């Protein structure tokens, strides 16, 4: 669960070409960590990335990130809280 500003820096890191062109759509739409991971071609077109070409690269990173989360999730399954 990373912050909205976190996403923006993740995009600048992994989607440089797309950041100059589409930084604002992620700001305008408040794409948080949880939100980024639910993202799809159809959704990205709805935030205003009109060009399927660019949309692909953004999900190529979104999915590569989704994968890396599953390595950490699956490792965990082999090794927070609250108490009332």
């Amino acid at each position: 669960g990373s912050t909205q500003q976190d996403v923006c820096k993740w995009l600048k890191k992994h989607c440089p070409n797309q950041y100059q062109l589409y930084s604002e759509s992620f700001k305008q739409h408040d794409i948080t960590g949880r939100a980024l991971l639910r993202l799809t071609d159809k959704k990205l077109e709805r935030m205003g990335i009109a060009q399927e070409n660019q949309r692909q690269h953004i999900l190529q990173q979104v999915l590569q990130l989704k994968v890396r989360e599953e390595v950490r999730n699956l490792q965990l399954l082999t090794q927070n809280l609250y108490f009332q």
């Binding site: 669960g1 909205q4 305008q28 739409h29 408040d30 794409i31 948080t32 949880r34 939100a35 639910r38 959704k43 709805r46 935030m47 692909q56 999900l59 190529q60 999915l63 590569q64 989704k66 994968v67 599953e70 390595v71 999730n73 699956l74 399954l77 082999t78 927070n80 809280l81 609250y82 108490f83 009332q84």
Partner: protein, 291 residues
């Protein structure tokens, strides 16, 4: 079951707004409009994009937050009575089969360059990821019921993750994935064949459980994990606690309501607030595993 809990589809607009109050801070600005439009649990379970937009929700991050909550709402209303180990196994085998038929399909098409390219299409990732989800769901159901074979699936899911990360041609990536697919299924069949024929079809149920505190605002004596998927799961209790003596709270149970309030999509924060509200006790609606 309608004896323990009233369907989400029966919720009034008030009931809708009530559950909406425990979601993300950034989404409250909207409950004013949900109110004014008299949005009911009826319409909520199937709220559309255009409806979200008419309620004032433009930022599709905010939309996605709402729909991820409502998706959980759907799992509760339709799935709880329904999802069993057979179901889960079918969903795993299905996403692996589809992956396989995907791969062999691609390879006969005229536009195939998989023997040349190392550029892995986005279909692949969403498929691999989805399959790993199916396997995690199967295992989350297996842990709350009656070790070697648990590691199998975990390794297999991991082999997937490292396959799609390898700077590899796609034909070889496809051969590797095709292999994991065939064996992951076989493990799934094996898990099933080894399963008692009464439990394997039973699904989870709901229960109401009343706690009584013995001092002002005392610990009820339970530990609660809040998963990323949104679940609020009891992981254990503490000895000589109200929770322990009631003999009715067990590790794996999931908090569905607190004092007759559904807290399913809620932020830990607001659930915490719920549990703490009455220092004198708490009514818990718990999702109980068939075991």
């Amino acid at each position: 079951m309608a004896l323990i809990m009233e369907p989400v589809s029966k919720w009034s607009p008030s009931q809708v707004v009530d559950w909406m109050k425990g979601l993300d801070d950034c989404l409250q600005q909207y409950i004013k409009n949900f109110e004014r439009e008299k949005i009911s649990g009826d319409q909520l379970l199937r709220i559309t994009h255009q409806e979200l937009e008419d309620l004032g929700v433009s930022r599709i991050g905010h939309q996605e937050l709402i729909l991820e909550a409502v998706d959980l709402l759907c799992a509760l209303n339709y799935g709880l009575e329904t999802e069993n180990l057979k179901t889960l196994s079918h969903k795993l085998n299905a996403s692996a089969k589809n992956l396989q038929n995907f791969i062999t399909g691609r390879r006969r098409s005229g536009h195939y360059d998989g023997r040349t390219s190392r550029k892995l299409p986005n279909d692949f990732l969403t498929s691999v990821v989805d399959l790993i989800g199916a396997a995690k769901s199967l295992l989350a159901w297996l842990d709350r019921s009656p070790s070697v074979t648990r590691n199998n699936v975990i390794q297999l899911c991991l082999e997937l993750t490292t396959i799609v990360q390898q700077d590899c041609t796609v034909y070889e990536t496809e051969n590797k994935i095709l292999h994991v697919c065939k064996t992951l299924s076989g493990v799934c069949d094996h898990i099933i064949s080894l399963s008692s024929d009464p439990l394997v079809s039973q699904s989870a149920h709901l229960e109401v459980i009343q706690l009584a505190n013995i001092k002002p605002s005392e610990g009820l004596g339970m530990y609660i994990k809040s998963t990323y998927d949104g679940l609020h799961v009891i992981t254990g209790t503490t000895e000589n606690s109200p929770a322990d003596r009631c003999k009715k709270i067990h590790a794996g149970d999931e908090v569905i309501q607190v004092n007759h309030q559904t807290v399913v999509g809620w932020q830990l924060k607001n659930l915490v607030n719920a549990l703490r509200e009455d220092p004198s006790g708490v009514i818990l609606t718990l999702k109980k595993r068939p075991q």
